[PDB]
Write a protein that binds this DNA or RNA. Structure first.
Ligand SMILES: Nc1ncnc2c1ncn2[C@@H]1O[C@H](COP(=O)(O)CP(=O)(O)OP(=O)(O)O)[C@@H](O)[C@H]1O
Ligand SMILES: [Mg+2]
Ligand SMILES: [Zn+2]
Ligand SMILES: [Zn+2]
Ligand SMILES: [Zn+2]
Lengths: 46, 65, 33, 84, 134, 56, 56, 263
RNA sequence: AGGA
């Protein structure tokens, strides 16, 4: 449960806080994505 | 980019008819005009759906994440 | 020997990485073939 | 200078611009809760009331028609023909 | 369909005729001001500045960024940022008033320097309507 | 443009659905309007006086 | 010519135009959203008091 | 046997050719319209997304899910949520479907109309089952996944009509024709040299007599005899797109009578 | 850089 950030290439879960270095815990590439809400999204199918 | 379910113009389900249309072309060595017709697509509205589709999904699938 | 500034490279040119890359490589590279 | 009633040489007819300005002025007045000089026969739009006042010729206004020299003829909305 | 206009099959439009995806990337970065004076990517509250946007800050998480699932609408704050002075001034990036949609992709990176760099892609689906050009 | 006395005319409001201004087809010529994506301007008078000017 | 001869103005709206055979020569189709923005300042008078109290 | 007659030319699982006789055009057409527009069906109308790692957008997929034809055989014993007394939905007024798919394989993993599973109670009534007319029994291809590409959705199918959205369209195209020999002059053929040569002859010409040139114009002649073909999508069987059309139109008229009664 |  809970995965704060996702690496843009290797797709490994990161889960970091403010002042914890914007970089992957394996490869380099400082990209990092946000990982969608637990607050679930609903669409009228039209 | 991914086969449309239902013909825009008349609403005939076309979502199932893709995998087969591709087989009738490769496996059965058929021409488009026959393949389409064997799948029941008689009205030109239905024909253009399958005939003029560009299954872009297949390219997008080629990217890692 | 000595560093005299940086030159912007045109994509797909000799000096660019993609010039030598194959379809399969470009896809890995997150670039449209 | 102000031209006398005998000696007035402008149209005996009201101008498209005069009529419009009168209807506007009276509508604006009626709307600002001014007294109405006509029976509103169930009337509620100040412009529609203004048309009724002009029709019954019960509008207490005067047109001051200025001339290029600066002189003028004063005309009552009562006396002005409405062929418009 | 007179004078260069046309009649479209509402039924067809429902079936997916002419629908489009629309994306837009709002971007921002934490700025450093000589004397190690940095900006913060955070969700702000009242706190002496009171200089904040008229729309909801509630869609923001503790990093001052909306999660990549959330439906955004008015001038909803998409990026939360503050600049204090000699305290939380607001530097929060709201969704273009005229627009709306769903947060698509949020990207948290590093500046050429070493500052916190952020890019937010928002996505909407545009359905053929009456004034639309073809 | 607005090269005409008739390139600005007063109309009766008709509140309607959908996002476009709708005009009668015969009124198309004085404006030089067509529906290949033309846009038009609407001006609301704020006085009882200005309204009259427009209607009259 | 920029700020005196011409001016930007309030009580103004602009959208795409489309033709309607069901509109009268003198009317204009005004999108609801536009009507809900453009306002006319009506004075509280005995003739309208009740009507206005309802729109408020 | 009675008033307007019917003569089925060809029947099948999903197509009915028939000749409607002893009717007014205004009635054949009113029936035509109803079959397209006003017969109720069941269709996915709410998609709640839990996960999507796909190349397609949440709403793009959502749109597709609505268009997937569902069993609407017993649609009459289901309520419109509007009419139903619950907060949102329930078993009285909806069918709840589930879709979970993940790319376990190295090869492209497909997502089908079959992969949908009913999680609600169907009160023992023929409804909600995705229509599979497919040869290999798969139905509509919703999506495609690669590896860690996951999909998680909960779908609420509801009773509705085509007038609200075409996804509740019980029928595909409806063939309709009258007077294959233009004896009524309801058309004036555009030609170059000869209208009779340049314009193809209808298959229905065989079921009516040719005009015979040496005859005066029959002005008295009225339009009856309608060559029609109703095609089903799957939700409701062909016969029922015809029957339920007739019943829908009938109720629509009866409402007017009842409206006059309350008056 | 685009729109009538
Ligand atoms: N630069 C410009 N400045 C002012 N008005 C312009 C303009 N360009 C176009 N217009 C206006 O737009 C009108 C339409 O021009 P176009 O969009 O090119 C179609 P058209 O030339 O009228 O031929 P068509 O009606 O047979 O299609 C003009 O008649 C003119 O009033
Ligand atoms: Mg034009
Ligand atoms: Zn990594
Ligand atoms: Zn079709
Ligand atoms: Zn219910």
């Amino acid at each position: 449960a809970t995965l704060k950030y996702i690496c843009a290439e290797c797709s490994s879960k990161l889960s970091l806080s403010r002042t914890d270095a914007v970089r992957c815990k394996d490869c380099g590439h400082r990209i990092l994505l946000k990982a969608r809400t637990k607050r679930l999204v609903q669409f009228e199918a039209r | 980019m991914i086969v449309p379910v239902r013909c825009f113009s008349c609403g005939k389900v076309v979502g199932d008819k893709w995998e087969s249309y591709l087989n009738l072309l490769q496996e059965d060595e058929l021409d488009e005009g026959t393949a389409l017709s064997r799948l029941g697509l008689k009205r030109y509205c239905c024909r253009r759906m399958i005939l003029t589709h560009v299954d872009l999904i297949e390219k997008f699938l080629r990217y890692n994440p | 020997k000595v560093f005299i500034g940086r030159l912007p490279i045109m994509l797909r040119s000799k000096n660019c990485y993609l010039s030598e890359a194959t379809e399969s490589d470009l896809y890995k590279l997150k670039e449209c073939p | 200078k102000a031209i006398p009633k005998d000696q007035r040489a402008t149209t005996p007819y009201m101008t498209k611009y005069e009529r419009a300005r009168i209807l506007g002025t009276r509508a604006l007045q009626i709307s600002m809760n001014a007294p109405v000089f006509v029976d509103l026969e169930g009337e509620t739009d100040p412009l529609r009331i203004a048309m009724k006042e002009l029709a019954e010729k019960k509008i207490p206004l005067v047109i001051r028609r200025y001339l290029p020299d600066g002189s003028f003829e004063d005309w009552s909305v009562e006396e002005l023909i409405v062929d418009l | 369909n007179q004078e260069d206009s046309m009649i479209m099959n509402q039924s067809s439009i429902d079936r997916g005729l002419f629908r489009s995806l629309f994306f837009r990337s709002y971007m921002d970065q934490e700025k450093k001001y000589g004397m190690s004076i940095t900006e913060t990517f955070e969700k702000p509250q009242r706190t002496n500045t009171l200089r904040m946007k008229h729309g909801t800050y509630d869609k923001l998480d503790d990093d001052g960024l909306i999660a990549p699932g959330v439906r955004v609408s008015g001038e909803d704050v998409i990026i939360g940022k503050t600049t204090p002075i000699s305290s939380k001034r607001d530097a929060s990036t709201p969704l273009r008033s005229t627009e709306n949609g769903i947060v698509d992709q949020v990207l948290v990176t590093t500046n050429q320097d070493g500052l916190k760099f952020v890019k937010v892609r928002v996505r909407t689906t545009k359905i053929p309507q009456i004034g639309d050009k073809f | 443009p607005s090269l005409h006395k008739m390139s600005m005319m007063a109309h009766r409001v008709k509140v309607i659905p959908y996002s476009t201004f709708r005009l009668n087809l015969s009124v198309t010529s004085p404006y030089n309007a067509d529906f290949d994506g033309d846009e038009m301007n609407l001006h609301v008078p704020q006085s009882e006086e200005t309204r009259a000017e427009l209607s009259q | 010519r920029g700020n005196l001869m011409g001016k930007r103005v309030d009580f103004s709206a602009r959208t795409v135009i489309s033709g309607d055979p069901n509109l009268e020569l003198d009317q204009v189709g005004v999108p609801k959203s536009i009507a809900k923005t453009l306002t006319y300042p009506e004075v509280v008078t005995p003739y309208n008091i009740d009507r206005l109290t309802q729109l408020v | 046997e009675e008033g307007p007659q019917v003569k089925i030319r060809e029947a099948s699982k999903d197509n009915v050719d028939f000749i409607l006789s002893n009717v007014d055009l205004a009635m054949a057409n009113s029936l035509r319209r109803v079959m397209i527009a006003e017969i109720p069906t069941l269709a996915i109308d709410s998609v709640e997304v839990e996960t999507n790692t796909t190349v397609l957008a949440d709403e793009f997929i959502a749109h597709r899910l609505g268009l997937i034809p569902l069993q609407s055989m017993d649609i009459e014993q289901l309520e419109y949520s509007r009419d139903c007394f619950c907060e949102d939905h329930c078993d009285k007024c909806s069918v709840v479907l589930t879709l979970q798919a993940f790319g376990e394989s190295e090869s492209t993993t497909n997502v089908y109309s079959k992969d949908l599973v009913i999680v609600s109670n169907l009160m023992g009534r023929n409804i909600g089952h995705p229509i599979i007319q497919d040869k290999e029994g798969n139905g509509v291809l919703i999506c495609k996944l690669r590896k860690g590409q996951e999909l998680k959705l909960t779908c609420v199918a509801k009773k509705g009509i085509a007038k609200e959205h075409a996804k509740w369209g019980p029928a595909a195209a409806i063939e309709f024709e009258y007077d294959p020999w233009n004896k009524l002059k309801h058309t004036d053929y555009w030609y170059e040299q000869d209208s009779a040569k340049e314009w193809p002859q209808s298959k229905n010409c065989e079921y009516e007599d040719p005009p015979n040139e040496g005859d005066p114009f029959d002005y008295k002649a009225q339009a009856d005899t309608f060559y029609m073909n109703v095609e089903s999508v799957g939700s409701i069987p062909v016969d029922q797109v015809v029957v339920r059309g007739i019943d829908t139109l009938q109720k629509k008229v009866a409402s007017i009578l009842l409206a006059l009664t309350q008056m």
